[PDB]
């Protein structure tokens, strides 16, 4: 059988020009399609039989394929454009379809955005329940890296922290939770409860308390 | 309005075999190949094999040949996916997609996949379905907090709205976090004017568990 094969990450500035290359024996005779996937969503068609575009999709996105290389070339790349892509064709031979492996297409050059940090104490209906868990939910910072460290009474507190990962919203900028479960007491015997969070150096805190 | 509507989340012991369905709507089913696609967690995308709607001739990724059996009903336009014996590798997304035009032809009438399901869901799992707890998160305080915390579920996914659809704009909800218990846990909270009862509707179909939760300031 054949195998296609794409670089696995490929970078640009923004309005600048991305070429995605799809590599495979004689796949300049075979007929290449192209996905576009954003994550937690369905792939998008967005270049098929080598170069045609379906309806709906610019001229900006267009395609060749020749020799042993497929390529996708993106131009005027819009922050909107990050996603993966996969190169695809059918292969007689084997009468397979066969994707390529995907490539991870990033648009360094959008602004800082600093973490919006907001923070819950536990629920009387929680405590009552013998219960206690303390709430820190990250958003709408962007680039999508983010530390979060738990305060207690001036002491960091490991146990019992749970966060996501750097999740992406509707707005393009990330977001993520930090889950503190502590015991009734910890939560009744310490003055108060702090979440604080570090992007690019700079730090976000918010504090609680019973 | 040419779509694919998969059908919903499904959980399963390990060895135990699950029926996907994808129905087809707004063109004539007989007219395309139906393809399916896997894709793990943080994976990429597989070609899984497809079917003719027409005659419900198959063909299989060597991969998956054997393990997985797909059929389809033309009487409702719905293509249907089998897989056998499953394994923990199994969970994933499961697509079914629409591309290859009928008939057979000696080349390939193959246009690359134009119409995609919106996947299902596959977890293949030992542990036993439980509901969530829903404890409110009273707001502090211009704009307020006000949240709902739905804690220690299984499993994915939990379908929260505010006020019965009604207060829509303002709803945060977060992508949940996989706790050391095996239990998941996402909060679904409303940033609104400081100076009207807020109730979240919280509901985990795959344990029948609807609670209704009024959040009101302490």
């Known amino acids: 059988q054949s195998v296609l094969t794409q670089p696995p990450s490929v970078s640009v500035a923004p309005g600048q020009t991305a070429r995605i290359t799809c590599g495979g024996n004689?796949?300049?005779?075979?007929?290449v399609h192209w996905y576009q996937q954003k994550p937690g969503q369905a792939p998008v068609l967005v270049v098929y039989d080598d170069s045609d575009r379906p309806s709906g999709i610019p001229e900006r996105f267009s395609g060749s394929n020749s020799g042993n290389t497929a390529t996708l070339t993106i131009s005027r790349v819009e922050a909107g454009d990050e996603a993966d892509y996969y190169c695809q064709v059918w292969d007689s031979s084997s009468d397979h379809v066969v994707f390529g492996g995907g490539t991870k297409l990033t648009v360094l050059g959008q602004p800082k955005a600093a973490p919006s940090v907001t923070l819950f104490p536990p629920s009387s209906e929680e405590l009552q329940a013998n219960k206690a868990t303390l709430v820190c939910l990250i958003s709408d910072f962007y680039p999508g890296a983010v530390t979060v460290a738990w305060k207690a009474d001036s002491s960091p507190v490991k146990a019992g922290v749970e966060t996501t990962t750097p999740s992406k919203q509707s707005n393009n900028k990330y977001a993520a939770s930090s889950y503190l479960s502590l015991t009734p007491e910890q939560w009744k015997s310490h003055r108060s409860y702090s979440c604080q969070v570090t992007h690019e150096g700079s730090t976000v805190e918010k504090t609680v308390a019973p | 309005q040419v779509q694919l509507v998969q059908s919903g989340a499904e959980v399963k012991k390990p060895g135990a075999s699950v029926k996907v369905s994808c129905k087809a709507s707004g063109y004539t089913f007989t007219d395309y190949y139906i393809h399916w696609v896997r894709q793990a967690p943080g994976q990429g995308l597989e070609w899984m094999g497809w079917i003719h709607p027409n005659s419900g001739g198959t063909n299989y990724a060597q991969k998956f040949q054997g393990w997985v059996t797909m059929t389809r009903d033309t009487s409702i336009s719905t293509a249907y996916m089998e897989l056998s014996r499953l394994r923990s590798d199994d969970t994933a997304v499961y697509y079914c997609?629409?591309?290859?035009?009928?008939?057979?032809?000696?080349?390939?009438?193959?246009?690359?996949?134009?119409?995609w399901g919106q996947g299902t869901t596959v977890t293949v799992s030992s542990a036993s379905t439980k509901g969530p707890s829903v404890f409110p998160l009273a707001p502090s305080s211009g704009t307020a907090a006000l949240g709902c915390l739905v804690k220690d579920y299984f499993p994915e996914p939990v379908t929260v709205s505010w006020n019965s659809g009604a207060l829509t704009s303002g709803v945060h909800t977060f992508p949940a976090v996989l706790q050391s218990s095996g239990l998941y846990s996402l909060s679904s909270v409303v940033t609104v004017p400081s100076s009207q009862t807020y109730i979240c509707n919280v509901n985990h179909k795959p344990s029948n568990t609807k609670v209704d939760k009024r959040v009101e300031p302490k």
């Open positions: 004689n796949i300049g005779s075979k007929s």
């Open positions: 997609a629409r591309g290859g035009l009928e008939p057979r032809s000696v080349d390939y009438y193959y246009y690359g996949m134009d119409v």
